[PDB]
Design a protein around this ligand. Structure first.
Ligand code: NA
Ligand code: NA
Lengths: 93, 93
DNA sequence: GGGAATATTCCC
DNA sequence: GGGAATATTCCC
C-alpha cells in the first residue's frame, strides 16, 4: 500500500480532521467539506503540498471517482469504512 | 530553468544561509557546512523535504559533481558565482 | 550515483 | 481527468 492510500485512510478515519474530511453516512465514500480550509490547513500536515488539485490528482491516479462552501464526495470500490483490508486492491494507474 | 536550479542559486547566494551553504572562495563551486543542521533547518525552507540525500539526488540529476562536522563541496561547469546567465546551460539528466 | 517507483506540478 | 515534466523516495 503506497503512502497516499495509508495517509488517505488515516485522514478520513481520524476524528480530529472530520470538520474537513470524513466518511459519508453509508461509509462507501468520503466527503471533503470547506475545501479552501482543507487544503490550506489539513493537506500540508499529511502531504508535501497545500493544493486541492494535487490531492485530487492523486485520487484520480488511484481510480477514485467523484460522486455527483460546498461538500465534495469521492469513492473507490475498495475504499470502504471498516474494511481497510481492501486497500491492497487499489491500484495506481 | 527548473525550480531546483533557481532555488539552489538563491540558496548559495543568499547571505542568511552562508553558515550552511555558500560559494567557495574561487566562486567555481559551493560548500555545504554542518550538513546535519543544513538538512534539518535549511532544506525544508526551500524544498519539500529535509533529507540531504534528496538534495544530493537533485545535484546528481543536474550533473553536479562532488569535489574531493566537515564541509562538502560540489561543482558544475555552468554553476559559477556572478554568472547566473550560465544556469540555462545546465541540463537535467 | 543512478534507475525506477511514487509524489507533485504543470498544462491540455 | 490524465499525460508528461520535475521532485522526492526507495533501493541497488
Ligand atoms: Na477525518
Ligand atoms: Na548562502
Amino acid at each position: 500500500v503506497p503512502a497516499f492510500l495509508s495517509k488517505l485512510w488515516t485522514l478520513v478515519e481520524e476524528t480530529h480532521t472530520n470538520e474537513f474530511i470524513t466518511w459519508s453516512q453509508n461509509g462507501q465514500s468520503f466527503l471533503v467539506l470547506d475545501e479552501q480550509r482543507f487544503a490550506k490547513e489539513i493537506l500540508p500536515k499529511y502531504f508535501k503540498h497545500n493544493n486541492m488539485a494535487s490531492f485530487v490528482r492523486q485520487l484520480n491516479m488511484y481510480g477514485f471517482r467523484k460522486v455527483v462552501n460546498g461538500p465534495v464526495e469521492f469513492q473507490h470500490p475498495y475504499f470502504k469504512q471498516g474494511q481497510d483490508d481492501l486497500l491492497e486492491n487499489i491500484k495506481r494507474k
